[PDB]
Symmetry: C2
Subunit: 239 residues, 2 copies
Amino acid sequence: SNELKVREFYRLHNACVKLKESIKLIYENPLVTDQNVLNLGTAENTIDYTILNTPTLNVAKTLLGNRYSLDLIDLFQSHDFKDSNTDVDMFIKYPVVYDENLENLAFMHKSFPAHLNDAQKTQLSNERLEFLGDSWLGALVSYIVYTRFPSANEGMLSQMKESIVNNNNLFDWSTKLNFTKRLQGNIATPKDKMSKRYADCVEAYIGALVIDRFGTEFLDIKEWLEELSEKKLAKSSQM
Amino acid sequence: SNELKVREFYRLHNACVKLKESIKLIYENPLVTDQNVLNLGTAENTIDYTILNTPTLNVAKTLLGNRYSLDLIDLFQSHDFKDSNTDVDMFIKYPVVYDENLENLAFMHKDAQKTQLSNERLEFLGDSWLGALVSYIVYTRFPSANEGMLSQMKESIVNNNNLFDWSTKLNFTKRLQGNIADKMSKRYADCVEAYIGALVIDRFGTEFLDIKEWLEELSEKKLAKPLNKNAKNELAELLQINKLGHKLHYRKLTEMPPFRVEVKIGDILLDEAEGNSIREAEHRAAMKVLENDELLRKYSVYDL
Ligand SMILES: [Mg+2]
Ligand SMILES: [Mg+2]
């Protein structure tokens, strides 16, 4: 309930961050502004007609033509909106999962081999999330080193990424994030096997964050990859 | 520039798709709807209070309050806006990279400028993101599969063999050709990954920004990045017999692992070194003196 309000706050704040980013792209797109710097209406086939009559241009032009009434960029500044810091941050340690169940699923230890069927066992183990979080930790970190070191070659980027995403470092993260006080249960813990399961949770948690945040930003790539993969994915034989 | 209009169009459309999605989240958020389902109260020292006074809630409420004038959801519906399809699609073959030079880079093979003239960094990025997107595809598509199954499905998609077939279907073969008419096969797979990398560069916005910034914060330390055993003895040759006639010795200050040792002649301090083991400090402390030409001239008997 208090947890719920904080969760819904970050859902809302992240939607505001995206709205702000997107309206700026819309207000400023060269196809939309009256200067027509790309010379729409100059093509000698129907391509310009097509572009001009899309829902996209219609919507964008209506938005741009409404700024006198409500200018969304000015709206955000008016209220000192900040993308990366909010007054609510003091109530959290790390980024928030919107869905409490998803978050809990992330800390649930995969038990090795009565009483539940295996389709609901997957809903009681962080192993799927770990699978996803592992992949996304890799992609985000690769993005970090790519943009952070524009001059580095692949060897450098790879070495740097590995020093970050390896299980040892992830155990240090789990320590930094107090994932220990998160795994306190009935049985005490008084390692090798240990460090690993902690690292799994760090990955699982990233998995949860991704599930909650995945929207439309990479949707066109996702849908494309999915269409290309369709024959392979239909071989869902090992299901 | 016919190319430019199309590139800018998909940049715009994707911004519109994101605006549509975001505005729906804002209009409908529990903290924002007038039915106050979560029950924000007016008590002063609470999260309720903190939330109610954020830039975020003020922006959200203003937006919701402006629907009567322009309802963004209505606006999209009234123009028949569609997220995944447009009439411009007839003019392209696969998702568009917004940045023409970035696209070209994706198709270039192999000092800091050399790095900017091959697709190897893009391939590095795209490999990662291809993996992430496919992992997301299988996870969501098969909610009852286990890690073992998800990995196997994903591997069957992201392996170099399959990527090679994609490059064929996408005609990346033609794009790689130039002046000069599984090795070559891997080069094609690399293009597919690099192109995915370029798509990602162009689209990466704020959707995963809070995660990204958090990871960078945790990562900062990882990102921000001798000894002479003939030292103690090479000192003795010079200083054991000295112009003071006093004893060259070493003195220990920290008896625990953070060891500190002073090199001295009688009461006179030559130098110090905080070594790990007593005998390494002594050597490094000597090292410092061995370099100090003025000290050696002052106390040494001979002349170098
Ligand atoms: Mg793992
Ligand atoms: Mg590769």
